[PDB]
């Protein structure tokens, strides 16, 4: 019964991804947003304790996705992927849905 994925959120701005993903309560919960600095380009914001970190969606040659290392045909992949490899070098973060309303 496929239904649309609770993390896209399109071209949200920067601070107000950081603004929502403030009242999540639990680390990890997370959005992918269309970057308005960087046009064409996806961002990923992910709620750490009192903070929103930001990671950059990175593109091979073939427009396969990325965070660091490990690469995907997909958004929807990369996202699955960093549900149980963390996606932070300096902490144990592993991407939960937000709790939607
Ligand atoms: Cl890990």
Not at 9 to 27: C, N, T, V, W, Y
Not at 45 to 59: A, C, E, I, M, P
Not at 64 to 73: P, R
């Amino acid at each position: 019964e496929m239904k649309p994925h609770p993390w896209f959120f399109g071209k949200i701005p920067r601070a107000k991804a950081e603004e929502m993903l403030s009242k999540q309560r639990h680390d990890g919960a997370f959005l992918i947003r269309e970057s308005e600095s960087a046009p064409g380009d996806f961002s990923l914001s992910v709620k750490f304790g009192n903070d929103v970190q930001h990671f950059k969606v990175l593109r091979d040659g073939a427009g396969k996705y990325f965070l660091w290392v490990v690469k995907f045909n997909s958004l929807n992949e990369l996202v699955d992927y960093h549900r149980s490899t963390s996606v932070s070098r300096n902490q144990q973060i592993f991407l939960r849905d937000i709790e939607q309303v």
